[PDB]
Design a binder for this molecule. Sequence first.
Ligand SMILES: Nc1ncnc2c1ncn2[C@@H]1O[C@H](COP(=O)(O)OP(=O)(O)O)[C@@H](O)[C@H]1O
Ligand SMILES: Nc1ncnc2c1ncn2[C@@H]1O[C@H](COP(=O)(O)OP(=O)(O)O)[C@@H](O)[C@H]1O
Ligand SMILES: Nc1ncnc2c1ncn2[C@@H]1O[C@H](COP(=O)(O)O)[C@@H](O)[C@H]1O
Ligand SMILES: Nc1ncnc2c1ncn2[C@@H]1O[C@H](COP(=O)(O)O)[C@@H](O)[C@H]1O
Lengths: 227, 226
Amino acid sequence: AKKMIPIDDDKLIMEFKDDATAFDGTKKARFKGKGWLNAQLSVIFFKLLEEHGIKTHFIGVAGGNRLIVEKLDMYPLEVVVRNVVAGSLKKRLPLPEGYELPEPIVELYYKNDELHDPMINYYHAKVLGISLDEIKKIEEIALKVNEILKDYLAKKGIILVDFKLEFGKDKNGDIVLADEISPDTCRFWDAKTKRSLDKDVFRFDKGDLIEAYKEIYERITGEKPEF
Amino acid sequence: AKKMIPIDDDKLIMEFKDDATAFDGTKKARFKGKGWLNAQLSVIFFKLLEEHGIKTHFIGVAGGNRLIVEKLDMYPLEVVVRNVVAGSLKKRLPLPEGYELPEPIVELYYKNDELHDPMINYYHAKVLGISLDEIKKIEEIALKVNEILKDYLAKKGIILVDFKLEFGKDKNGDIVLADEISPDTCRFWDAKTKRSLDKDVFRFDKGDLIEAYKEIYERITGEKPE
Ligand SMILES: Nc1ncnc2c1ncn2[C@@H]1O[C@H](COP(=O)(O)OP(=O)(O)O)[C@@H](O)[C@H]1O
Ligand SMILES: Nc1ncnc2c1ncn2[C@@H]1O[C@H](COP(=O)(O)OP(=O)(O)O)[C@@H](O)[C@H]1O
Ligand SMILES: Nc1ncnc2c1ncn2[C@@H]1O[C@H](COP(=O)(O)O)[C@@H](O)[C@H]1O
Ligand SMILES: Nc1ncnc2c1ncn2[C@@H]1O[C@H](COP(=O)(O)O)[C@@H](O)[C@H]1O
C-alpha cells in the first residue's frame, strides 16, 4: 500500500496508496481516501514521537499522501508491541481476546514474505546479523514509542491494542524509527465499545474502512478529514 | 493533617484530619470534608496500585477518614516523581511551568523539617544508611506507581503533574509503599483548563479547596462525595 520513491542516497518519498491488501494479496480492495488518511496519521504520529526525542525517518510532507523520509539501512524486522491480547497472540498465550496485559509485550518477526514473517528470538536475530546490543536498543525505543502512542490515544478514548514498527540505521549508525504508523499497522479499539478502528475492519469485513479511519483522524485532530 | 495511631507491633491506624497546613504552619485552616476526601482518595489509589502488584501498606478501612495500615520501618525519604514542570522544579531547570518532560524525573529529599527537607543524591542517601540497591528498588517502584497513576488519571482528564511518595521496610525486609496518596501530596491539573485540583489551591489561594478535591473524587468515582 506504499510506493517508495528514491530522491537520492539519503532521502526518499514514501507515497501512500488507496489499495487495501490482506491475506497475502488474496483479498484486495481500493478505498478512496485511505492513502491520504494514513499519510496524515503517520505525520501526526512521527511528529508526536519526534517531540519526545524519538529519532524517526520523518523529514516533511510533499503533498496529501506523500512523505519525505530519510533513507535508512533497514533492519529485516517487524517489531511488534502488544498491550491488549488480540490476533496471533491468542495462539501463543492462554488468554482471551481483549485481555489487558500487565506489561507490554515486544515480539520480533523476521521480515520475509516467503517464510510468512516468522517470529524470532535474540539468537535468531544474531544469525540474521543483528547484535544483542542493537536488539536491546530497538526494544527500548519500541517500548518508549508504545508508551507515548498508548497514552496519547487513551486520552482520546482509543485503546492501542498492538502495533508493528520498523527500524533502520542512518549515516551515523544511529537506530531510526521508519516505515509508517497508521491504522494499517496498529490495532486501535474504541475505549467504550471496543470496536476496531483499523485494518481489521477490512480483514474481517466488520464494517466500513474509510469510516473507521476517518473516526481515528477526527478524534486525534478534532476536525473532519480534508483530503 | 494525619494522626498515626498504633494498634500493635505490625499495624496502625492512619487518621486523616480536616486541618490544612502550609508554609511551615505559618498558614493554617480547616476544611470540613478534606480528611474524608483524602482518606477515600488514598484508598482508591492504594487498591488501584495493589491491583498492579505494587506492595503498599494499605490493609483496610476503619471508618470514613481512617485507614488501617501495616507498620513499617520507614525510609527517611520523600520520593518525588515529576511529569510536568511545576513548583520547585522551576528553580532547577530552565523550563516554564507546565512544560511536559520527555521522561519522568525522580528526586530524593531527606525527610527532616529542621533542614526543610533538602534534596539529596545517592551518595547522601548512603550516608543516611540507604544502600544503592534499595535506592534503585525504590526508584523503580516510584516510576511504576507514576505510570499507573498518570495513565489512570489522564483517562479522566487529570494531569498527574508531580507527586511525593514514602516507603518503608516490612517484617520480611521488602520495600513497601506507605504514607498517603491524595491531593495533599500530588499536583493534579485539569487537562482542559490546567487549573489545580490539589493543595496548591490552598497554598496560593487560587480557589475553593473542598471544591477541587470533590472534583477529583467525582471524576474518579463518577459519584458526588458521600
Ligand atoms: N526510511 C526508510 N528507508 C528505507 N526503506 C524503508 C524506509 N521506510 C520504509 N522502508 C521500506 O520500504 C517498504 C515500504 O513498502 P510497503 O508499501 O510498506 O510494502 P512492503 O512491506 O510490501 O514493502 C518496506 O520494505 C519498508 O521496510
Ligand atoms: N506504614 C507506615 N508505618 C510507619 N510510619 C508511617 C507509615 N506511613 C506513614 N508513616 C509516617 O507517619 C507520619 C505521618 O506524618 P504526617 O502527620 O503525615 O505529617 P508529617 O510528615 O509532617 O509528620 C510520617 O512520619 C510518615 O512518614
Ligand atoms: N506485515 C504487517 N504489516 C502491517 N502491520 C502488521 C504486519 N504484521 C503485523 N502487523 C501489526 O502488528 C500487530 C499484531 O499483529 P498479529 O501478529 O497479526 O496479531 C497488528 O497491529 C498488526 O496490524
Ligand atoms: N513535605 C511534603 N508534604 C506533602 N507533599 C509533598 C511534600 N514535598 C513534596 N510534596 C509533593 O511532591 C510534589 C513536588 O513538590 P515540590 O518539590 O515542593 O514542588 C508536589 O506534588 C508536592 O505535593
